[PDB]
Amino acid sequence: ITTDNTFVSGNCDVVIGIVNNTVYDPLQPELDS
Amino acid sequence: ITTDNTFVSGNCDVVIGIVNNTVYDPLQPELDS
Ligand SMILES: *[C@@H]1O[C@H](CO)[C@@H](O)[C@H](O)[C@H]1NC(C)=O
Ligand SMILES: *[C@@H]1O[C@H](CO)[C@@H](O)[C@H](O)[C@H]1NC(C)=O
């Protein structure tokens, strides 16, 4: 799950069926490296 | 106004009716931090 394929919206307390995970921004390896 | 919803083309000098404001790149806070 990458933020050039997903987008940020809303909060996790309303939608039903949402699950715990981590979403890997492709900007993160660029900024960490 | 996000660069994930707008794109990079042109300048202030061609298109009629442009108003002066700021554009919040969603990359900009990670660039700053
Ligand atoms: C319907 O979805 C909820 C939330 O995802 C889940 O807890 C529930 O078990 C589901 N219903 C069935 C019959 O599995
Ligand atoms: C994981 O999802 C649950 C909902 O099942 C939520 O309450 C929790 O805040 C989430 N995050 C965690 C455990 O870091």
From Swiss-Prot, chains A, B:
Q: Which residues are glycosylated?
A: N20
Domain of life from the UniProt record: Viruses
Functional description taken from the UniProt entry: Subunit of the fusion protein that is processed upon entry into the host cell. Mediates fusion of the virion and cellular membranes by functioning as a class I viral fusion protein. Contains a viral fusion peptide that is unmasked after S2 cleavage. This cleavage can occur at the cell membrane by host TMPRSS2 or during endocytosis by host CSTL. In either case, this triggers an extensive and irreversible conformational change that leads to fusion of the viral envelope with the cellular cytoplasmic membrane, releasing viral genomic RNA into the host cell cytoplasm.
Q: What is this protein called?
A: Spike protein S2'
The species this protein was found in: Severe acute respiratory syndrome coronavirus 2
Name of the gene: S
Q: Which residues of the full protein are shown?
A: 1115 to 1147 of 1273
